[PDB]
Amino acid sequence: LAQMEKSYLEKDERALEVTRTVSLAEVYAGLTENSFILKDKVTELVNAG
Amino acid sequence: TIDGQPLSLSLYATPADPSMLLSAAITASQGGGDLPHAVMPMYRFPVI
């Protein structure tokens, strides 16, 4: 336990904490294969389930 | 004597005394602990 604890304390560094906000409509539009508009496909798939 | 026994008595040699046994404790001297390389951790002073 002291071996593993000392290894954790020697190998622990701070961070690089990156938040990436991803809009799925952009990914569905830039799909480059059967790409679509999300707001129309949702009402299409809801009214035609 | 007339019977062949000697007039002058014999010499009595002294036996050896029992010696005193001796022992000893020889001692060794190994090196001390040398300091390793220090690493800086991520926590503050009361935590470490």
Rounded CA separation A49/A37 (Å) = 17
How many C-beta neighbours within 10 Å does residue A9 have?
15
Please list every residue in chain A whose beta carbon sits closer than 8 Å to the beta carbon of residue B43: 9
Please list every residue in chain A whose beta carbon sits closer than 8 Å to the beta carbon of residue B41: 9-10, 12
Rounded CA separation B15/B8 (Å) = 22
Elucidation technique? cryo-EM
List the 1-48 stretch of B: residues with Cβ below 8 A of A: 39, 41-43, 48
> Do A13 and B42 contact (CB within 8 A), yes or no?
yes
SS3 labels along A27-39: HHHCCCCCCCCHH
What the block records as the tokens of B13 is 């040699």
Nearest to B39 by CA among A25, A16, A13: A13
What the block records as the tokens of A12 is 């622990």
A13/B42 touch (CB, cutoff 8 Å), yes or no:
yes
